[PDB]
RNA sequence: CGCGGGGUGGAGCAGCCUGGUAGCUCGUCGGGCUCAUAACCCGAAGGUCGUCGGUUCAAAUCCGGCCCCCGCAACCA
RNA sequence: GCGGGGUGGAGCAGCCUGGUAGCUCGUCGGGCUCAUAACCCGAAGGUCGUCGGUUCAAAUCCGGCCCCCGCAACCA
RNA sequence: GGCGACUUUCUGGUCUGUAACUGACGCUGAUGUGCGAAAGCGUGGGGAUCAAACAGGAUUAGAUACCCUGGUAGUCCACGCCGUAAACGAUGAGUGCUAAGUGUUAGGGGGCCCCUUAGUGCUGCAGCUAACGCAUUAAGCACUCCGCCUGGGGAGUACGACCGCAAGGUUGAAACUCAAAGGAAUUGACGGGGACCCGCACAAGCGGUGGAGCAUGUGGUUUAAUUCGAAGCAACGCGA
RNA sequence: GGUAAAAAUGGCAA
């Protein structure tokens, strides 16, 4: 939980908030589970994305 | 498919009123290259506006154009509100003034143009309505400004 | 008729379809709410950041009338209007003490719907 | 025969109560945009409020009369 | 035996309650397209089954006639 | 085939080192006999989610679809049945041999480095291949054994048999018909593929055409003849 | 993240 610092802008706090969300990866997870992907497809995506990484 | 911007042509100041804008107004009024009739209409209109207004013709004309010219307009891309360029602002102002004057009911163009310029100074002309309508539709599409 | 809650929580649910902002006390009792749909935004306009801001501002203003001054922000969903809503709370005059993400995530739970083939 | 309620753009639906301030939504019309279509956005029109009186600074608004409509009693010539 | 219906080329309103021919499709002329379809625009086309009656006036009301449809056709 | 929270119980296989022991006790494998995704079937239980069928909404010329809101079987458990998948590395199993380089998993050995065993990837010789490619994880070089193929369609159909509760599975023709089916690669063309660029292509503007009268060409129609030629752009004030 | 929606057809020869 980002807490606004003393003498810190809400906009500055918002920057900190956005970064923490990115590291958490909650957005990433949400998009993946929007629609069902068959087991074989899931495994392929995991592999090739890792190949990219 | 275009190379780039093309340099714009320039106009000499109006002899009678020493305004570049006055020269551009003549150009919009002119039809079929008939400059003299266009100049005649404008100068006569400026006499009538001053006569009725009791104020300098250029002053009221400047006041009129200021009301007609629009800060924002919608462009199809969803319609997006966009800032009108300074040069575009003048084009739209002059075009709207002349076009809406032509749609007025007075018998002669000079009277129509004077009634329009007077009305626009009072912020009540059809050209003013055009700006107001343009601004309204731009505000309605404010969400798409991004 | 007039409550006096100084400290409250603002919940922003931002989706690709809509933005809803509910302001509650710390115990989860609602004070005010607004949405893009409530303000009369329709279709694409509902999900725009502008609509989210307007929803946030409306909800904040009503909540302040109950004496809310400070707010803790909880954000749920992936929609484009989350940041605008947070800024609107500050703009409305409420102070954001903390911002937290509460979007729900299963630990491999229920089957998601079919992918849209079109 | 009593009692209760209502009559408001083409229609429905408020303000009536708690007098000054006929709104709202569709149906219209003209535009914009949409390849487009629809939707959406913008402008414009249409009820003087059931009617007629009284009272009041001011009444669709209140009080009265009157008419129409609806519901419920009355329903053992 | 008794009801119902017969309306542009098709299907379907208008009749009750006389004065008013509607809607969708089709047709026709134009447009779009390389062309066709789709789509867009403009337009034409029904003596209202047929003879009579009544009426100032009949798709409309009334009576025949022809056609069609439904129902009935029982007790021995 | 498959197997992904954790814990415990029961239980299978594999790899490394060592070299106690046994002493060729091995390999393959017709017929057999088991296991075998998903859907499906039977009996009983369960039912969150998702979701054939089905029902609305929408889209459309139509929309028995795609998209939206719902929704039953099913999806789950147990015990039976079914026995099939692009059940794929479209690559049977065993054994030995044949350049290297680099990553990674589980070990072993010796000084972070080197060596080594068994997997798992990438790159790449020789050799192989129609080509694409393969290349110590061979599609190279060899030996053993098994399964399978012999143009396309008809047809995985018919009939018979066997198996199955059923759905169906396994096995499996012919008449007739054709001169082709096919694999890989190449040059083009094309795409509601991509990148990058242009052109009054669009955008931004200005003035028109389509409506009127008339001139003219054309079509059609007419006529004794209305001479012949031009026909999307690139015929139609065109040959004239 | 996106995404605009709709978007049918066209004898065999040479
Ligand atoms: Mg056509
Ligand atoms: Mg199953
Ligand atoms: Mg569905
Ligand atoms: Mg098989
Ligand atoms: Mg290896
Ligand atoms: Mg013409
Ligand atoms: Mg063809």
JSON list of N, CA and C (backbone and C1' of nucleotides) in Angstrom, two decimals, chain E residues 50-63:
[
{"chain": "E", "resi": 50, "resn": "U", "atom": "P", "xyz": [-65.35, -6.70, -59.95]},
{"chain": "E", "resi": 50, "resn": "U", "atom": "O5'", "xyz": [-66.68, -7.51, -60.36]},
{"chain": "E", "resi": 50, "resn": "U", "atom": "C5'", "xyz": [-66.63, -8.39, -61.51]},
{"chain": "E", "resi": 50, "resn": "U", "atom": "C4'", "xyz": [-68.00, -8.98, -61.72]},
{"chain": "E", "resi": 50, "resn": "U", "atom": "C3'", "xyz": [-69.15, -7.98, -61.87]},
{"chain": "E", "resi": 50, "resn": "U", "atom": "O3'", "xyz": [-69.23, -7.60, -63.24]},
{"chain": "E", "resi": 50, "resn": "U", "atom": "C1'", "xyz": [-69.74, -9.73, -60.33]},
{"chain": "E", "resi": 51, "resn": "C", "atom": "P", "xyz": [-70.12, -6.34, -63.72]},
{"chain": "E", "resi": 51, "resn": "C", "atom": "O5'", "xyz": [-71.57, -7.00, -63.58]},
{"chain": "E", "resi": 51, "resn": "C", "atom": "C5'", "xyz": [-72.72, -6.14, -63.75]},
{"chain": "E", "resi": 51, "resn": "C", "atom": "C4'", "xyz": [-73.97, -6.86, -63.32]},
{"chain": "E", "resi": 51, "resn": "C", "atom": "C3'", "xyz": [-75.11, -5.95, -62.84]},
{"chain": "E", "resi": 51, "resn": "C", "atom": "O3'", "xyz": [-75.89, -5.52, -63.94]},
{"chain": "E", "resi": 51, "resn": "C", "atom": "C1'", "xyz": [-74.79, -7.75, -61.28]},
{"chain": "E", "resi": 52, "resn": "G", "atom": "P", "xyz": [-76.48, -4.03, -64.04]},
{"chain": "E", "resi": 52, "resn": "G", "atom": "O5'", "xyz": [-77.65, -4.13, -62.96]},
{"chain": "E", "resi": 52, "resn": "G", "atom": "C5'", "xyz": [-77.39, -3.69, -61.60]},
{"chain": "E", "resi": 52, "resn": "G", "atom": "C4'", "xyz": [-78.54, -4.10, -60.71]},
{"chain": "E", "resi": 52, "resn": "G", "atom": "C3'", "xyz": [-79.07, -3.02, -59.76]},
{"chain": "E", "resi": 52, "resn": "G", "atom": "O3'", "xyz": [-80.06, -2.20, -60.36]},
{"chain": "E", "resi": 52, "resn": "G", "atom": "C1'", "xyz": [-78.56, -4.95, -58.52]},
{"chain": "E", "resi": 53, "resn": "G", "atom": "P", "xyz": [-80.27, -0.68, -59.87]},
{"chain": "E", "resi": 53, "resn": "G", "atom": "O5'", "xyz": [-80.62, -0.87, -58.32]},
{"chain": "E", "resi": 53, "resn": "G", "atom": "C5'", "xyz": [-81.87, -1.52, -57.97]},
{"chain": "E", "resi": 53, "resn": "G", "atom": "C4'", "xyz": [-82.01, -1.55, -56.47]},
{"chain": "E", "resi": 53, "resn": "G", "atom": "C3'", "xyz": [-81.92, -0.20, -55.75]},
{"chain": "E", "resi": 53, "resn": "G", "atom": "O3'", "xyz": [-83.14, 0.52, -55.80]},
{"chain": "E", "resi": 53, "resn": "G", "atom": "C1'", "xyz": [-80.64, -1.82, -54.60]},
{"chain": "E", "resi": 54, "resn": "U", "atom": "P", "xyz": [-83.16, 2.13, -55.70]},
{"chain": "E", "resi": 54, "resn": "U", "atom": "O5'", "xyz": [-82.59, 2.35, -54.23]},
{"chain": "E", "resi": 54, "resn": "U", "atom": "C5'", "xyz": [-83.42, 2.05, -53.07]},
{"chain": "E", "resi": 54, "resn": "U", "atom": "C4'", "xyz": [-82.68, 2.44, -51.82]},
{"chain": "E", "resi": 54, "resn": "U", "atom": "C3'", "xyz": [-82.14, 3.88, -51.79]},
{"chain": "E", "resi": 54, "resn": "U", "atom": "O3'", "xyz": [-83.15, 4.81, -51.42]},
{"chain": "E", "resi": 54, "resn": "U", "atom": "C1'", "xyz": [-80.45, 2.38, -51.06]},
{"chain": "E", "resi": 55, "resn": "U", "atom": "P", "xyz": [-83.19, 6.28, -52.07]},
{"chain": "E", "resi": 55, "resn": "U", "atom": "O5'", "xyz": [-81.79, 6.86, -51.57]},
{"chain": "E", "resi": 55, "resn": "U", "atom": "C5'", "xyz": [-81.63, 7.19, -50.17]},
{"chain": "E", "resi": 55, "resn": "U", "atom": "C4'", "xyz": [-80.20, 7.63, -49.92]},
{"chain": "E", "resi": 55, "resn": "U", "atom": "C3'", "xyz": [-79.69, 8.78, -50.80]},
{"chain": "E", "resi": 55, "resn": "U", "atom": "O3'", "xyz": [-80.09, 10.06, -50.31]},
{"chain": "E", "resi": 55, "resn": "U", "atom": "C1'", "xyz": [-78.08, 7.04, -50.71]},
{"chain": "E", "resi": 56, "resn": "C", "atom": "P", "xyz": [-80.66, 11.19, -51.30]},
{"chain": "E", "resi": 56, "resn": "C", "atom": "O5'", "xyz": [-79.38, 11.58, -52.16]},
{"chain": "E", "resi": 56, "resn": "C", "atom": "C5'", "xyz": [-79.52, 12.52, -53.27]},
{"chain": "E", "resi": 56, "resn": "C", "atom": "C4'", "xyz": [-78.16, 12.93, -53.79]},
{"chain": "E", "resi": 56, "resn": "C", "atom": "C3'", "xyz": [-77.11, 11.80, -53.86]},
{"chain": "E", "resi": 56, "resn": "C", "atom": "O3'", "xyz": [-77.17, 11.09, -55.09]},
{"chain": "E", "resi": 56, "resn": "C", "atom": "C1'", "xyz": [-76.18, 13.68, -52.75]},
{"chain": "E", "resi": 57, "resn": "A", "atom": "P", "xyz": [-76.93, 9.51, -55.12]},
{"chain": "E", "resi": 57, "resn": "A", "atom": "O5'", "xyz": [-75.45, 9.38, -54.51]},
{"chain": "E", "resi": 57, "resn": "A", "atom": "C5'", "xyz": [-74.33, 9.79, -55.32]},
{"chain": "E", "resi": 57, "resn": "A", "atom": "C4'", "xyz": [-73.06, 9.67, -54.51]},
{"chain": "E", "resi": 57, "resn": "A", "atom": "C3'", "xyz": [-72.76, 8.29, -53.90]},
{"chain": "E", "resi": 57, "resn": "A", "atom": "O3'", "xyz": [-72.14, 7.43, -54.85]},
{"chain": "E", "resi": 57, "resn": "A", "atom": "C1'", "xyz": [-72.40, 10.00, -52.29]},
{"chain": "E", "resi": 58, "resn": "A", "atom": "P", "xyz": [-72.40, 5.84, -54.87]},
{"chain": "E", "resi": 58, "resn": "A", "atom": "O5'", "xyz": [-70.91, 5.24, -54.74]},
{"chain": "E", "resi": 58, "resn": "A", "atom": "C5'", "xyz": [-70.04, 5.66, -53.67]},
{"chain": "E", "resi": 58, "resn": "A", "atom": "C4'", "xyz": [-69.65, 4.47, -52.82]},
{"chain": "E", "resi": 58, "resn": "A", "atom": "C3'", "xyz": [-69.61, 3.11, -53.54]},
{"chain": "E", "resi": 58, "resn": "A", "atom": "O3'", "xyz": [-68.49, 2.34, -53.14]},
{"chain": "E", "resi": 58, "resn": "A", "atom": "C1'", "xyz": [-71.00, 2.98, -51.64]},
{"chain": "E", "resi": 59, "resn": "A", "atom": "P", "xyz": [-66.98, 2.79, -53.49]},
{"chain": "E", "resi": 59, "resn": "A", "atom": "O5'", "xyz": [-66.21, 1.51, -52.92]},
{"chain": "E", "resi": 59, "resn": "A", "atom": "C5'", "xyz": [-66.31, 0.26, -53.64]},
{"chain": "E", "resi": 59, "resn": "A", "atom": "C4'", "xyz": [-65.96, -0.88, -52.72]},
{"chain": "E", "resi": 59, "resn": "A", "atom": "C3'", "xyz": [-66.80, -1.02, -51.45]},
{"chain": "E", "resi": 59, "resn": "A", "atom": "O3'", "xyz": [-67.95, -1.82, -51.69]},
{"chain": "E", "resi": 59, "resn": "A", "atom": "C1'", "xyz": [-64.48, -1.08, -50.91]},
{"chain": "E", "resi": 60, "resn": "U", "atom": "P", "xyz": [-69.38, -1.44, -51.06]},
{"chain": "E", "resi": 60, "resn": "U", "atom": "O5'", "xyz": [-69.03, -1.26, -49.51]},
{"chain": "E", "resi": 60, "resn": "U", "atom": "C5'", "xyz": [-68.81, -2.42, -48.67]},
{"chain": "E", "resi": 60, "resn": "U", "atom": "C4'", "xyz": [-68.29, -1.97, -47.33]},
{"chain": "E", "resi": 60, "resn": "U", "atom": "C3'", "xyz": [-69.33, -1.37, -46.37]},
{"chain": "E", "resi": 60, "resn": "U", "atom": "O3'", "xyz": [-69.17, -1.83, -45.03]},
{"chain": "E", "resi": 60, "resn": "U", "atom": "C1'", "xyz": [-67.58, 0.20, -46.75]},
{"chain": "E", "resi": 61, "resn": "C", "atom": "P", "xyz": [-69.92, -3.15, -44.51]},
{"chain": "E", "resi": 61, "resn": "C", "atom": "O5'", "xyz": [-71.44, -2.70, -44.69]},
{"chain": "E", "resi": 61, "resn": "C", "atom": "C5'", "xyz": [-72.03, -1.74, -43.77]},
{"chain": "E", "resi": 61, "resn": "C", "atom": "C4'", "xyz": [-73.48, -1.53, -44.13]},
{"chain": "E", "resi": 61, "resn": "C", "atom": "C3'", "xyz": [-74.20, -2.71, -44.79]},
{"chain": "E", "resi": 61, "resn": "C", "atom": "O3'", "xyz": [-74.70, -3.61, -43.81]},
{"chain": "E", "resi": 61, "resn": "C", "atom": "C1'", "xyz": [-74.65, -0.69, -45.99]},
{"chain": "E", "resi": 62, "resn": "C", "atom": "P", "xyz": [-74.89, -5.17, -44.13]},
{"chain": "E", "resi": 62, "resn": "C", "atom": "O5'", "xyz": [-76.12, -5.12, -45.15]},
{"chain": "E", "resi": 62, "resn": "C", "atom": "C5'", "xyz": [-77.45, -4.85, -44.65]},
{"chain": "E", "resi": 62, "resn": "C", "atom": "C4'", "xyz": [-78.42, -4.84, -45.80]},
{"chain": "E", "resi": 62, "resn": "C", "atom": "C3'", "xyz": [-78.44, -6.10, -46.68]},
{"chain": "E", "resi": 62, "resn": "C", "atom": "O3'", "xyz": [-79.25, -7.13, -46.16]},
{"chain": "E", "resi": 62, "resn": "C", "atom": "C1'", "xyz": [-78.39, -4.14, -48.04]},
{"chain": "E", "resi": 63, "resn": "G", "atom": "P", "xyz": [-78.94, -8.67, -46.49]},
{"chain": "E", "resi": 63, "resn": "G", "atom": "O5'", "xyz": [-79.34, -8.73, -48.04]},
{"chain": "E", "resi": 63, "resn": "G", "atom": "C5'", "xyz": [-80.75, -8.66, -48.39]},
{"chain": "E", "resi": 63, "resn": "G", "atom": "C4'", "xyz": [-80.94, -9.01, -49.85]},
{"chain": "E", "resi": 63, "resn": "G", "atom": "C3'", "xyz": [-80.22, -10.25, -50.38]},
{"chain": "E", "resi": 63, "resn": "G", "atom": "O3'", "xyz": [-80.96, -11.43, -50.06]},
{"chain": "E", "resi": 63, "resn": "G", "atom": "C1'", "xyz": [-79.97, -8.45, -51.90]}
]
